[PDB]
Amino acid sequence: EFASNSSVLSLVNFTVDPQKAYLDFVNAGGAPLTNCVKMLTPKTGTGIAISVKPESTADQETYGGASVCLYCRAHIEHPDVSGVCKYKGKFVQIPAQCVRDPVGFCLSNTPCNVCQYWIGYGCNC
Amino acid sequence: ASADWKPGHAMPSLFKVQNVNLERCELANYKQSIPMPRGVHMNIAKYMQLCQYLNTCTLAVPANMRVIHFGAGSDKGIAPGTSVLRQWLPTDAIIIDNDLNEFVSDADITLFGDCVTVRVGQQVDLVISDMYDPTTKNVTGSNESKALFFTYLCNLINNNLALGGSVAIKITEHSWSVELYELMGKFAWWTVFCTNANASSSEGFLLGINYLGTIKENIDGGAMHANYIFWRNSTPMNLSTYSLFDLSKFQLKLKGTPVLQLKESQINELVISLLSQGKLLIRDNDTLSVSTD
Ligand SMILES: C[n+]1cn([C@@H]2O[C@H](COP(=O)(O)OP(=O)(O)OP(=O)(O)OC[C@H]3O[C@@H](n4cnc5c(N)ncnc54)[C@H](O)[C@@H]3O)[C@@H](O)[C@H]2O)c2nc(N)[nH]c(=O)c21
Ligand SMILES: [Zn+2]
Numbered sequence: 188e189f190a191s192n193s194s195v196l197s198l199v200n201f202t203v204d205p206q207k208a209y210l211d212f213v214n215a216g217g218a219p220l221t222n223c224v225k226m227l228t229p230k231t232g233t234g235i236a237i238s239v240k241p242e243s244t245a246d247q248e249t250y251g252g253a254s255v256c257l258y259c260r261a262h263i264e265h266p267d268v269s270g271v272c273k274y275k276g277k278f279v280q281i282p283a284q285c286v287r288d289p290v291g292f293c294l295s296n297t298p299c300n301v302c303q304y305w306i307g308y309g310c311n312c
Numbered sequence: 313a314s315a316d317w318k319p320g321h322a323m324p325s326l327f328k329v330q331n332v333n334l335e336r337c338e339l340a341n342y343k344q345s346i347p348m349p350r351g352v353h354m355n356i357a358k359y360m361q362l363c364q365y366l367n368t369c370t371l372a373v374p375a376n377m378r379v380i381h382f383g384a385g386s387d388k389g390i391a392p393g394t395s396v397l398r399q400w401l402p403t404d405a406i407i408i409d410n411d412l413n414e415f416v417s418d419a420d421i422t423l424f425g426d427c428v429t430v431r432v433g434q435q436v437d438l439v440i441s442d443m444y445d446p447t448t449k450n451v452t453g454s455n456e457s458k459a460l461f462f463t464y465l466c467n468l469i470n471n472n473l474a475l476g477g478s479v480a481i482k483i484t485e486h487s488w489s490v491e492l493y494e495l496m497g498k499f500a501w502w503t504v505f506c507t508n509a510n511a512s513s514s515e516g517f518l519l520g521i522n523y524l525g526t527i528k529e530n531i532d533g534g535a536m537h538a539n540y541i542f543w544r545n546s547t548p549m550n551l552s553t554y555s556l557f558d559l560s561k562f563q564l565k566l567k568g569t570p571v572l573q574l575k576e577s578q579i580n581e582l583v584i585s586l587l588s589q590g591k592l593l594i595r596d597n598d599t600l601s602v603s604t605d
């Protein structure tokens with residue numbers, strides 16, 4: 188586990204596009220990053236993507252946000268222009284069918300700018 | 313049975329008043345393990361149960377609440393206890409965490425290194441410590457009071473803790489401090505809380521609730537640790553996480569506890585009573601500055 192995490196986290200230090208490097212790695216069958224911080228929650232939340240408290244519905248799990256951020260986990264520079272991570276200090280809801288790879292889910296999807304639900308997994312605009 | 317649905321067990325005054333020699337701690341389920349609900353980290357369950365017990369205590373819960381979390385790294389490079397604190401605390405609470413080696417965390421401020429390198433410039437409202445020194449496992453002679461990181465924590469209580477503030481500091485059979493027990497006598501109330509998730513460990517969180525800055529209870533710390541072990545040796549505790557099955561009231565109550573600046577001489581009976589009920593904090597209301605030195 189730790190040896191395996193250390194491997195993919197090492198790999199995304201050898202690349203100019205860590206997001207693509209991670210997604211290409213897991214798409215080719217590489218082991219997703221483990222040891223994400225899954226919370227226990229009353230599955231009675233709003234279901235939005237990113238939230239100051241856990242907001243998981245019955246169809247989601249909530250993670251501590253830093254732990255599902257590739258840039259935090261790999262200790263590399265965040266791509267956001269403001270420099271501030273979008274997840275760290277917050278909670279991230281993941282559809283329950285995607286809990287095998289929370290980091291890959293996060294790198295592959297985008298909260299809706301209007302309703303802040305995941306596009307394709309909640310956003311109904 | 314109700315015990316299983318509680319988050320854990322708190323040392324009762326029945327054992328606080330005993331007078332016994334310090335004995336070996338012998339737990340009938342020692343090191344038995346319980347699988348974790350949904351396979352979250354064990355520290356998720358442990359911190360949640362600590363928080364649930366603190367929900368029953370008279371914690372002061374102000375705006376911009378100042379929380380420092382020591383020993384916050386675990387599980388090879390992450391901080392599940394910090395994320396539980398983020399789930400528990402008010403959204404405007406400030407969490408500072410710290411551990412010896414690098415880790416990733418949801419705290420507002422994360423500092424690496426010995427806890428001694430953590431310079432608290434102001435006073436804080438809540439101290440959580442999960443620190444434990446590995447050398448404590450090298451049990452040779454008799455079980456004596458330890459210095460280690462407790463010296464730092466004792467000084468922090470005496471200088472960097474708001475009146476009305478509280479502390480939850482992990483101890484074990486062999487990881488403990490006479491001086492820290494004796495400082496519990498400067499709080500309105502104190503106990504040791506043992507989670508049900510880790511009931512099979514001599515681990516307990518030494519709780520100081522509402523710091524008064526003056527001695528309320530005269531405690532002999534060596535004797536009190538002998539009483540803590542006597543309590544553990546006397547008290548069946550079955551592993552359990554049932555308390556986490558209903559999380560609807562988990563979050564810390566939004567008490568809006570006021571923060572007042574007061575001179576020592578102005579502290580009277582009314583102020584001590586408010587501090588002891590979780591209804592007041594006394595400290596600076598500057599901007600908090602906590603850095604590596
Ligand atoms: C309570 N107890 C202690 N010992 C013996 O006394 C020694 C020291 O006892 P201790 O003070 O460490 O207490 P205990 O063994 O209960 O602590 P435990 O391992 O549960 O650790 C508690 C917490 O400390 C931290 N911790 C433990 N080891 C480390 C570590 N190596 N590094 C960082 N943290 C650690 C973790 O948070 C852990 O959850 C034990 O290593 C064992 O030989 C016992 N032996 C029997 N046969 N039955 C017991 O009931 C018993
Ligand atoms: Zn990040």
Ligand SMILES: [Zn+2]
Pocket residue numbers: 299300301302303304310311312
């Ligand atoms: Zn939308």
